[PDB]
């Protein structure tokens, strides 16, 4: 990757925990960035993984994948530096802006997420935690796939007889074959994308809000699926459903998804919903 020198970085406003700062980065002028820093006390596990995340991020270069500016690996604090995404996480953003977007604008956000996942699928990179809480949004509504790593935070005692293996999965976002057999593929990512479509079209509602984790797992294997979002065009809900086919080989590929949405976008009568009608 690109090694940044501490001299070119300046932290400013703390904005989260993983800490994650807002700061500035000099190039020769300066730009705003997000700075992920390791806890002020760490282990070979918590440090070797911190660096290992950034080696993965550096492989990605796409308009819809969070862009790694560089890393600071030879000083304290160590830093993983990315572009700054002003509007934060998609799911919180959509609840904030509940109702303020047209169907065209929401489907444009899904097109961008799909385009990032298509790029990852062609790298043979499986995400495993594709959800709105892992999509960042910039001031131009461009959505970029990210991973905050909450699946890999473990609460095991350091002397426990039994420990978590293989991280944790987001039950409500994970395809059945992945839950049951740990068969993680881009096809299980497509399932998760279907859930993300539902998140966007409901402005961040909680999937299967009425049900417990075990009741979701039962519902899914009994053949039920999330219901239509309000004001959702027929074609969009039809597309989620195809993402949630029980046999993974029958689901669309991310390439088919990007293409299906492009066609709806360029024939926007297919995206008409009465709530977008203005009598004026
Ligand atoms: C192996 O796993 C992978 C790891 C990654 N890593 C990241 O996506 C990652 C790492 C480092 C940084 C600095 C950011 N940047 C942000 N993160 C947060 C944030 C806030 C609170 C808690 N956690 C995160 N807020 C941000 C930004 C930018 N703007 N804002 C408002 C993202 C990506 C992978 O696939 C592409 C795969």
Curated annotation (Swiss-Prot):
It comes from the Eukaryota. One of its GO terms (biological process) is positive regulation of protein localization to plasma membrane. It is linked to Cataract 6, multiple types: An opacification of the crystalline lens of the eye that frequently results in visual impairment or blindness. Opacities vary in morphology, are often confined to a portion of the lens, and may be static or progressive. CTRCT6 includes posterior polar and age-related cortical cataracts, among others. Posterior polar cataract is a subcapsular opacity, usually disk-shaped, located at the back of the lens. Age-related cortical cataract is a developmental punctate opacity restricted to the cortex. Overexpressed in several cancer types and promotes malignancy. The chain holds residues 605 to 890 of 976 of the full protein. The lineage of its organism: Eukaryota, Metazoa, Chordata, Craniata, Vertebrata. The active site is at residue 129. Expressed in brain and glioma tissue and glioma cell lines (at protein level). Expressed most highly in tissues that contain a high proportion of epithelial cells, e.g. skin, intestine, lung, and ovary. GO terms for cellular component: cell surface; focal adhesion; lamellipodium; lamellipodium membrane; leading edge membrane; plasma membrane; receptor complex; ruffle membrane. This is Ephrin type-A receptor 2. ATP binds at residues 15-20, 36. It comes from Homo sapiens (Human).
């Amino acid at each position: 990757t690109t090694e940044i020198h501490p001299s070119c970085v300046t932290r400013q406003k703390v904005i989260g925990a993983g800490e994650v700062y807002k700061g500035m980065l000099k190039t020769s002028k300066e730009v705003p960035v997000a700075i992920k820093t390791l806890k002020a006390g760490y282990t070979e596990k918590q440090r070797v993984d911190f660096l290992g995340e950034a080696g993965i991020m550096g492989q990605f270069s796409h308009h819809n994948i969070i862009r790694l500016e560089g890393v600071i690996s030879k000083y304290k604090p160590m830093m993983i530096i990315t572009e700054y995404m002003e509007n934060g996480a998609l799911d919180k953003f959509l609840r904030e802006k509940d109702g303020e977007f047209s169907v065209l604008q929401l489907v444009g956000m899904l097109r961008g997420i799909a385009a990032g996942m298509k790029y990852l699928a062609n790298m043979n990179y499986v995400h495993r935690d594709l959800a709105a809480r892992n999509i960042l949004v910039n001031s131009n509504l461009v959505c970029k796939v990210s991973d905050f790593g909450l699946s890999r935070v473990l609460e095991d005692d350091p002397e426990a007889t039994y420990t978590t293996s293989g991280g944790k999965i987001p039950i409500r976002w994970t395809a059945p074959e992945a839950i049951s057999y740990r068969k993680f593929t881009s096809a299980s990512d497509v399932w998760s994308f279907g859930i993300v479509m539902w998140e966007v079209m409901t402005y961040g509602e909680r999937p299967y809000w009425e049900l417990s984790n075990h009741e979701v797992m039962k519902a899914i294997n009994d053949g039920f699926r999330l219901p239509t979002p309000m004001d959702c065009p027929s074609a969009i809900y039809q597309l989620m459903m195809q993402c949630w086919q029980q046999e993974r080989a029958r689901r669309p590929k991310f390439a088919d998804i990007v293409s299906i949405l492009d066609k709806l976008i360029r024939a926007p009568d297919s995206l008409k919903t009465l709530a977008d009608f203005d009598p004026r």
